[PDB]
């Protein structure tokens, strides 16, 4: 499925603030957490597992990009798909979303679907 469909919600002007790397179910994963640039709004946690769902082949192309935007500190748009993970405690700690894209953002407009 495409990233910016009508079923995948997105969040604009997000700034990646944390990053956790680990392993679950014999497959590496990573979770980010983004607070808005202007400080307002609630954080948006979104993970990504290596080989669990239909979003598997886009793992390494995203981990290298989610780590880039972390080092700089630039505003990004983030696409997520709600309610993918069904793990007992993994859902309660980080989130149940699924990272499916990191569109870079300019001052006014953001380059990416919506």
């Amino acid at each position, epitope marked *: 499925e495409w990233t910016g469909d009508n079923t995948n919600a997105y969040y604009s002007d997000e700034v990646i603030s944390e990053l956790h790397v680990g392993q679950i*179910d014999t497959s590496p994963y990573f979770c980010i957490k983004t607070v808005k640039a202007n400080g307002s709004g609630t954080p948006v946690v979104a993970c990504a597992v290596s080989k669990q769902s239909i979003w598997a082949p886009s793992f390494k192309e995203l981990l290298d990009q989610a780590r880039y935007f972390y080092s700089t500190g630039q505003s990004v748009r983030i696409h997520v798909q709600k309610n993918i993970w*069904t793990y007992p405690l993994f859902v309660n700690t980080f989130s149940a979303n699924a990272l499916v894209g990191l569109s870079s953002c300019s001052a006014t407009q953001c380059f990416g679907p919506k």
Partner: antibody
Amino acid sequence: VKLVESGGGLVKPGGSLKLSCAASGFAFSTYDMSWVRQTPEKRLEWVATISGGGSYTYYPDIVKGRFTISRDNARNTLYLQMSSLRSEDTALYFCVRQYYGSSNYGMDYWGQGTSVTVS
Amino acid sequence: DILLTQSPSILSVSPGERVSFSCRASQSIGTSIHWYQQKPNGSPRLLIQYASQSISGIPSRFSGSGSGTDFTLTINSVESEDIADYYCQHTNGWPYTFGWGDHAGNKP
């Protein structure tokens, strides 16, 4: 066909079986799969569910310890091993694909359905 | 657990008319309820997931809806090929209790 569900035609009340449900044409490492039963009254009921690799497994309240769902990647099988079959549990026993891999969405294309019977 | 009440159990409708099932849950589910279609002597297939989102490859005549404790499937224009059983899925938690299943009877 992508789903075969081979195994199980008749077992005395207390024996055991193993239902394969071999897959053909999708990423079997992903796509958390599970089992779903019918009934002689045509009412579907849940049986089991296995995660991606198999480290996570769930069962309903009616079934705990009798059924055990497995998963053998590199061969694309499920191998539901039954045990202590009561007078009930005479059903079709489909296996599903859990559309998008997640277990929170639904069931993609189902199988053909075996026929277990206990008498 | 959570029980799903699929009332009524039969829908005798002339072809070419909108039908509406009814799947009232016991506990508030929110929007995690799905629908299937099992023709007689066959394996079911997904129609609408999350009670609002359809699935590609499905004829657009099916249009689910509902939120809270009242969820319904609205086939806008029935045909003589829609005589099948329509079940309810539930995925708020374990276990995944199905529904009863209704028929779409078409009498000439």
